[PDB]
Assembly symmetry: D2
Homo-oligomer: 256 residues x 4
């Protein structure tokens, strides 16, 4: 059998999620707790449950400006069902729009497991001019308030552990070595928290997708119900710079 899975099975037409009867989860687990279960394979603790609710809310939407929203709404504008627009948004979560969560989780997890000093790890990255994933922001040069909020919650709950500490120690050390502070950004913060929960770095973008899809749904629904179809189109004379060949004739012999 080529179709193998350990996620879900049906016993007597009833759905079981990671071994639990779905009908027993309905009304008893929150959606974030059920998400933790389906992804991890086991029920979350109370502290994990609260952190998962906070991580997912943290990324629920970022407005109309990101390429995901532009893509989702442009596909909707072409005259498509809501699922099709949302899917187009999800496609935009590439290396520059979600991949940093995977990269930062790998860096934080490998950093903690290496048992090498934060000084040595940061020196090695800064020396080879390789970007440290999950650090830096165009505007925030003191701290990323989204990271601070998540870390404050992690500390109040006594969830904050070795991965959170490592991620913050690295920001402080980058500042020390560069003489210029580089913040632990929200991608690095979510990566630290998901790592603290024991999730594989290869699942990093999953948290972002699950959290942001409600925002995409809102954007696509708004485009479909408040805008005329085909309204998302550029005005070539106003919005576009042409950089190509000026007009030219085909060779005469090719004209029929």
């Amino acid at each position: 059998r080529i179709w193998k899975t350990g996620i879900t099975q049906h016993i007597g037409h009833e759905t079981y999620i990671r071994g639990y009867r779905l009908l027993d989860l309905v009304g008893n687990l929150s959606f974030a707790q059920a998400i933790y279960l389906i992804l991890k394979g086991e029920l979350p603790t109370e502290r994990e449950s609260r952190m998962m609710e906070a991580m997912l809310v943290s990324v629920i939407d970022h407005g109309i400006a990101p390429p995901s929203a532009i893509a989702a709404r442009s596909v909707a504008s072409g005259g498509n069902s809501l699922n099709v627009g949302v899917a187009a948004g999800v496609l935009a979560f590439g290396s520059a729009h979600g991949g940093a969560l995977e990269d930062a989780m790998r860096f934080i997890q490998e950093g903690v497991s290496s048992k090498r000093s934060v000084e040595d790890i940061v020196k090695e990255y800064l020396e080879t001019k390789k970007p440290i994933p999950g650090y830096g922001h165009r505007y925030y040069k003191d701290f990323d308030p989204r990271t601070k909020r998540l870390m404050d919650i992690a500390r109040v709950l006594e969830f904050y552990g070795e991965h959170c500490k490592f991620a913050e120690d690295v920001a402080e050390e980058i500042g020390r070595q560069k003489g210029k502070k580089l913040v632990l950004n929200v991608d690095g913060a979510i990566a630290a928290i998901a790592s603290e929960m024991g999730f594989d770095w290869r699942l990093g973008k999953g948290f972002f997708i699950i959290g942001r899809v409600p925002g995409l749904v809102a954007h696509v629904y708004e485009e479909l119900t408040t805008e005329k179809p085909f309204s998302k189109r550029l005005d070539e004379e106003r919005d576009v710079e042409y950089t190509g060949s000026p007009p030219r004739e085909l060779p005469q012999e090719l004209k029929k």
Copy 2:
């Protein structure tokens, strides 16, 4: 400005969701409550919050068999990032795999607002041989346990209202008119509950997408981490029936 929105804005680089500071929502609202807010535009009541958690959990996954899971995992098998596989799954939520939520919400809402008798509404549909959306199941002929669970919760919470009543009254009336019971299925149940919350029928598939994306993430992650790339391919001799032209030669003059 062609890019208009009432969903989110940034004030001093901080994100505001439907007017609320996102950093104040983080740690204070559950993910399902934040979903209600972003979609509806206002905070949910306590009863709405509980029903939204239950609806979303109800659809979190349905195993590897649906075309969404097949598509998501086949795209992942082609050697793609997790977002790309999940998006392919979302594309599969078409008229036969999610559209019934839109249709059932329109039927339930129009049914309630018409103030026509349930007998008359059902007689008109059965007479014109048009399928009644949100009713019937291949296996469940007494009741859909997923609907029963959701409706039991709605009744315990005193959330059950005119839309839930209408949806159940229609199932009973179909049974009365056909002499054969046709259940209110889980699509009809979610449609009734979302209608009870005052959501537009055009948002119906949104609830399904938001709820099921965690399952798609789990399936795509499992395919990427437990299976060899390109393992999702058919065996033509074993799995395929060819119904086309038998082999034939091109005309000789076309062979160079």
Copy 3:
């Protein structure tokens, strides 16, 4: 066997397309001729071959302004492989960006097969205020030059037939009944030509997709190789109009 097909089969690991050995088609049929074969199931005539080359070239690209190009390039900007950006473009070919080909083919084919007068058909549509598919243009009020080019070729080749005639007769009749000319647009022209070839109206968008994908590839490649990742993002203060709730505080009791 649930996987049935009459398109392609393998005999001794060799691919056969609609019964012809693919290796015999390579070097002997043009790409447009092979497209006709795979879609229709039989080889094209010389006139069909020339018309298919012309239809496909007619739609090869329309610049960066359409929502398909915007979506494709925005997905590429998110940091994605070329296939992922192209696919996002294809998603945008909805009811307002390709669906008119399906609609116009159905209208032209049903119009020709009804044997009702063009006067009566147009009167019935204009009376019920239903848009006639494949007619009208924002700028072209005399003739669509893209339609004229295709129809001139169809006439020179003696391909122009009952479907082409019907489509042009309808434009003339709309003008006669409205006292204002409404052109047969390029969607209607391609629909007429594909109908003249005997293709099903349900394949209409297929011609557009096949023809335009080279343009999408060009756009995505250009975005990936000439622009910095994440460059396709709006500037909220400059490009966006916010129409939602002004900022508001959460209820105090919800703040922890």
Copy 4:
């Protein structure tokens, strides 16, 4: 202006592709020639034109078995428009289903430009156990007939050059060093030909997408017109192996 392009522009509402009036290309260039133009930026020679027709035909379809066809048809089965199914197919062209064209073009181009001996290049790859892109096949151990057909055409046309020679010299050298022949497969053959044309290796998947989309259209159209919606679903008891947790009860305190 953030939307820059050198591909297409409009002058007086008329489309210009790489500086040529689109209406002059229609009826005068074949579709494969127009594809070459839009991708390369200049008109093809007669030999390039013939090779482009042959490359594109070579990949037009591969039947229902690949994950692209499975994904496209499964999305169509969910009840979606033809563009949506085709797009899902295109998403499946990942690292294991199209990426080898990019890799093989880079290898062939870098191999030719290095001016290092084929012996040295192959020894370095075989020593580090890195797969050589564009070589090997599960069944063909003497030669890939699809490569032979393309190379025979390239030789008859006097198109065969330094890139084609390098690609074939590498297959012969792998055989010499391993004592077991590894064929130049069709991905390597197309990569060699596209490299001979001077295309960038980053465009490799583009040729595959453009060539295969007609096959995807055929598959999606066939699924939509010959199969019942939702027919593409697995039978869990027959097709799936469950490898997860056996059923288990939730903790009693969580049951309300």
